[PDB]
């Protein structure tokens, strides 16, 4: 079901090195619906090359956006398994912090501040 089930550790870390190789400006994301979550739909895939220059604050909003949400539909995303501490800092940043060992970045959504 989840990203990490379907691929070995040595498959994650080799299309990380792939993305690197032809798409270096480009963060690789894993973003992922809340195994419990009810409201909010499923993405149409799991793998997201997010330019390096944007914030947290703007991946949101094209999140929001891919899901096609409405201004009171709640929206809540965990980074490498927790709450982000800021939404302005830029995804280069926390991909040097927060990247999983296998080289991408784990985002979780949820209706919910409670997953
Ligand atoms: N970069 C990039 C993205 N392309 N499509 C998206 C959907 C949601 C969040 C980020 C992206
Ligand atoms: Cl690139």
């Given amino acids: 079901k989840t990203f990490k089930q379907r691929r070995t550790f040595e498959q994650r870390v080799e299309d990380v090195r792939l993305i690197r190789e032809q798409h270096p400006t480009k963060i690789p994301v894993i973003i992922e619906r809340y195994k419990g979550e009810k409201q909010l739909p499923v993405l149409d895939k799991t793998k997201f090359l997010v330019p390096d220059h944007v914030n947290m604050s ?24 927790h709450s982000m501490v800021s939404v302005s800092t830029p995804i280069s940043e926390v991909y040097e912090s927060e990247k999983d060992e296998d080289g991408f970045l784990y985002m979780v959504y949820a209706s919910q501040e409670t997953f």
């Fill in 58 to 81: 703007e991946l949101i909003k094209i999140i929001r956006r891919r899901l096609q949400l409405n201004a009171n539909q709640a929206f809540f995303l965990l980074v490498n398994g």
